C-alpha cells in the first residue's frame, strides 16, 4: 500500500500540477464504443465513447524503489484523490456517466508522474441539421471538448498526435463515417469577463443512405403520378372515371406530403424531398385540369388534346427527372 | 485474479427494432479467490454476510460493453449478496437491469432470427 499511500500523503487535489508555472497539458483521446443515429426531430445524436486523458503531474512521480511493468494500474475508485481536468462537452444536451457494477474509470500512473484517465461516457450531442437536399444531404456533427474553470493560462488541451478518434465499426442505420477532420485545436473559446477557454473538436461527416427513400417515398409516389396518366386513353365520355382517377392523384400525394414531414424537424425552407412531392402533386393536378380542358371542348374533336397529352406529360415529366436527379444527386 | 461469473435472467422484453435494443434484468454472480479473507474462527464452510459489508472488499469492475443504460436496484435495500467462503472464495450476486443494444439484420424482417449479445467486460484492469 505504501506505493500509493506514500504519494497521496502531502498531495492536494485542489491544486493543479505546476500551480504558478506553465499550463497543464492534456492529450485528449477518444474511442467510439457506439454511435447512435441522428435524431432529426431533436437535432441530436447519442454516442457512447471512452474519453481518455493523459497529462503530467510531477507530484505523482513513482519512487525509484518501484519496478512495476511500466505503469501503476490502481483502483479505479482512486480517481477522487487526484487532480483532474474539468472538460465538458459544449454540444451535449444530456450526458451520463456509467456505473453498471462500479464506476467505469481507468487510472494509470506512469513512472514520471504521467497520468492516464479513461472515463466511459454516453453523450447526447446536439448538431444542427441543414436539411436542404434532404434525402441526399450530408451533415457534420461536432464533439467539442472544452475546459470550464481553467483558462488557457492554466489548462490546455490537444488531440492525440496519432489517431484521436478510434472508431472501428459502427454501421449506422442510414448513415456512415469513414474518415474526417479532427480539426481546430485553436477552437479556444473567448468569453467576456472570464477569458480564453480551451477547445478541441471532431466534426464527423454523415452521408445519408437514400435507399430507404427510394422505396418508401420516391417509388410509391412515382407510380401514383403514372396512375394519373391512365385517364388519357380512357374514353372521354366516361366523366365518372377520369375525374375520380385524377382526384386520387392529388389526394394521395397530398397525404404523402404530411406523412413524410410528420417525423422531421419543422425547418422553414424547401428541401429536396418537398420539391419532388410538390412537383408530383402538380403533375397529378395538371392531368385533372387537362380533363377540364377536354370536357369544355366537347361543349361546342377533343381527342387531339388527349392525343397531344398522351405523349407530352411523360415527356414533360421524364424531363423533370433529369433536371431533379442531376441537381440533388 | 480470475472471476468465474454466471447470469440469471429474470425477464426479456421491450425488444425494440426501432430503438434497436432490449431490456433485461439479471443476477450477475461472480466468484473469485481473495487469500486475505480466509478465516479459522468460525467452523462454517460458507458464511453469508450483510450486503452493507459488500462495500469494503475488492470487487471486479466489470461493465457491459453494449449495456446502453443500466441501474442497480435499491428497492427497500441494496439488492446485493455476499458470502465469504472460509478459504477466501467470495461470492457476489447483484441485481441489474440492462437495456442492452443488439444490431438487428432485418433482411427478412417478419420471419427473421436475431442474435443479441451480452458482453461482460473489465474496464480498469488489464488482462494480467
Amino acid at each position, epitope marked *: 500500500s505504501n506505493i500509493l499511500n506514500r504519494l497521496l500523503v502531502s498531495y492536494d487535489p485542489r491544486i493543479r500540477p505546476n500551480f504558478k508555472g506553465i499550463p497543464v497539458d492534456v492529450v485528449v483521446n477518444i*474511442f467510439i464504443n457506439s454511435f447512435g443515429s441522428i435524431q432529426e426531430t431533436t437535432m441530436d445524436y447519442r454516442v457512447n465513447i471512452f474519453l481518455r486523458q493523459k497529462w503530467n503531474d510531477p507530484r505523482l512521480k513513482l519512487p525509484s524503489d518501484f*519496478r*512495476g*511493468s511500466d505503469a501503476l494500474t490502481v483502483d479505479p475508485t482512486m480517481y477522487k484523490c487526484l487532480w483532474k481536468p474539468d472538460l465538458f462537452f459544449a454540444n451535449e444536451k444530456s450526458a451520463n456517466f456509467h456505473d453498471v457494477t462500479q464506476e467505469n474509470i481507468l487510472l494509470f500512473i506512469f513512472r514520471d508522474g504521467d497520468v492516464l484517465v479513461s472515463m466511459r461516457l454516453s453523450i447526447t450531442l446536439s448538431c444542427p441539421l441543414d436539411l436542404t437536399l434532404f434525402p441526399m444531404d450530408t451533415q457534420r456533427c461536432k464533439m467539442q471538448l472544452e475546459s470550464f474553470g481553467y483558462t488557457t493560462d492554466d489548462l490546455r488541451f490537444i488531440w492525440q498526435s*496519432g*489517431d484521436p478518434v*478510434q472508431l*472501428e465499426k459502427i454501421a449506422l442505420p442510414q448513415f456512415d463515417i469513414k474518415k474526417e477532420d479532427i480539426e481546430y485545436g485553436n477552437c479556444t473559446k473567448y468569453y467576456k469577463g472570464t477569458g480564453y477557454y480551451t477547445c478541441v473538436e471532431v466534426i464527423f461527416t454523415l452521408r445519408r443512405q437514400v435507399g430507404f427513400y427510394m422505396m418508401g417515398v420516391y417509388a410509391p409516389t412515382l407510380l401514383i403520378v403514372v396512375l394519373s396518366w391512365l385517364s388519357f386513353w380512357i374514353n372521354p365520355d366516361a366523366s365518372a372515371a377520369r375525374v375520380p382517377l385524377g382526384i386520387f392523384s392529388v389526394l394521395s400525394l397530398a397525404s404523402e406530403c404530411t406523412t413524410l414531414a410528420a417525423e422531421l424537424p419543422k425547418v422553414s425552407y424547401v428541401k429536396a424531398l418537398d420539391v419532388w412531392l410538390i412537383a408530383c402533386l402538380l403533375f397529378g393536378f395538371a392531368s385533372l385540369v387537362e380533363y377540364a380542358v377536354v370536357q369544355v371542348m366537347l361543349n361546342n374533336a377533343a381527342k387531339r388534346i388527349d392525343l397531344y397529352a398522351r405523349a407530352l406529360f411523360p415527356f414533360c415529366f421524364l424531363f423533370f427527372n433529369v433536371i431533379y436527379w442531376s441537381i440533388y444527386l | 485474479v480470475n472471476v468465474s461469473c454466471n447470469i440469471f435472467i429474470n425477464s426479456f422484453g421491450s425488444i425494440a427494432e426501432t430503438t434497436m435494443d432490449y431490456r433485461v434484468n439479471i443476477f450477475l454472480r461472480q466468484q473469485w479467490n481473495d487469500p486475505r479473507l480466509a478465516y479459522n474462527e468460525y467452523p462454517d464452510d460458507s458464511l453469508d454476510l450483510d450486503p452493507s459489508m459488500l462495500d469494503s472488499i475488492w470487487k471486479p469492475d466489470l461493465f457491459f460493453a453494449n449495456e446502453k443504460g443500466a441501474h442497480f436496484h435499491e428497492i427497500t435495500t441494496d439488492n446485493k449478496l455476499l458470502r465469504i467462503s472460509r478459504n477466501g472464495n467470495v461470492l457476489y450476486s447483484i441485481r441489474i437491469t440492462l437495456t442492452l443494444a443488439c444490431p438487428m439484420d432485418l433482411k427478412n424482417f417478419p420471419m427473421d432470427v436475431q442474435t443479441c449479445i451480452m458482453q461482460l467486460e473489465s474496464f480498469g484492469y488489464t*488482462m*494480467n
Partner: antibody
C-alpha cells in the same frame, strides 16, 4: 485466426525493407500485432507492438528508430520497416499476436532476412 | 527483466523427467510462458502464466515455480519433445525470453 507473412527477403547494407503480416481470419484493427526477431546463435527478441486501427505502437527500447510499425486496413495487413540494415539484422522476423494476455499464441511462418 | 536458462543443451532419454529452469531477474511471480520451436517453424505456445496449458497441447507438459525460479516439466518424453524450448516473461513491456534450452 491466422497470420500469413510475406516471403524471404535479401537486402544490402544501408537499405530498408518492409515486412508484411497478412491477417487472414480477423479484422487487422482488432488485436495487437506483435513483432519478434529470431537471430541464430542468439535467442528470440521482442521488437514491439502496433494496434493496427489506432496507430498505437510500443517499440522496444533497443529497436527505437531501427523499426517502424504501420498498418493498412485496405487489405488487413500490418507492416514493419527496418531502416539502416546491417549484418547484425540477419535473422528471422515473426509477427506474433497475444489475444488473452501478453504471451504469443498466434505466430507467423517467418520471413528470413539476410543483409 | 533478464530471463535466463542456464542449460543450453539437456540430455534425456525417451521416457524421462526433465526440468528446465528459467531463473527470472526480478519478481514477476506468475508471468512465464514456455514455447516449443521445431527446426524451421514458429515457436508454438505450451504454457502461459507458468501453470496453464494452451488449446491443443498434450498433457505431459507441466509448468511450476513462482517468484523468480521457474521450471518446465515433461513427465514422459516422447520423440517429438526433441526440440528447442523457450521461456518467456509477460509481466513487463520489454519482453525478453531468455536464450533457449535444447
Amino acid at each position: 485466426v491466422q497470420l500469413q507473412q510475406s516471403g524471404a527477403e535479401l537486402m544490402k547494407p544501408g537499405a530498408a525493407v518492409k515486412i508484411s503480416c497478412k491477417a487472414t481470419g480477423h479484422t487487422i484493427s482488432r488485436y495487437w500485432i506483435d513483432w519478434l526477431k529470431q537471430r541464430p546463435g542468439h535467442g528470440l527478441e521482442w521488437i514491439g507492438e502496433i494496434l493496427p486501427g489506432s496507430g498505437s505502437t510500443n517499440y522496444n527500447e533497443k529497436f527505437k528508430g531501427k523499426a517502424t510499425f504501420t498498418a493498412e486496413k485496405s487489405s488487413n495487413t500490418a507492416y514493419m520497416q527496418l531502416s539502416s540494415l546491417t549484418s547484425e539484422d540477419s535473422a528471422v522476423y515473426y509477427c506474433a499476436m497475444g489475444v488473452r494476455g501478453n504471451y504469443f499464441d498466434y505466430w507467423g511462418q517467418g520471413t528470413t532476412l539476410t543483409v | 527483466i533478464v530471463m535466463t536458462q542456464s542449460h543450453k543443451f539437456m540430455s534425456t532419454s525417451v521416457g524421462d523427467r526433465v526440468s528446465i529452469t528459467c531463473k527470472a531477474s526480478q519478481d514477476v511471480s506468475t508471468a512465464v510462458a514456455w514455447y516449443q520451436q521445431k527446426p524451421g517453424q514458429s515457436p508454438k505456445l505450451l504454457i502461459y502464466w507458468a501453470s496453464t496449458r494452451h488449446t491443443g497441447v498434450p498433457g505431459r507438459f507441466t509448468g511450476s515455480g513462482s517468484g523468480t525460479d521457474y521450471t518446465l516439466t515433461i513427465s514422459s518424453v516422447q520423440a517429438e519433445d526433441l526440440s528447442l524450448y523457450y521461456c518467456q516473461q509477460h509481466y513487463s513491456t520489454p519482453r525478453t525470453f531468455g536464450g533457449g534450452t535444447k
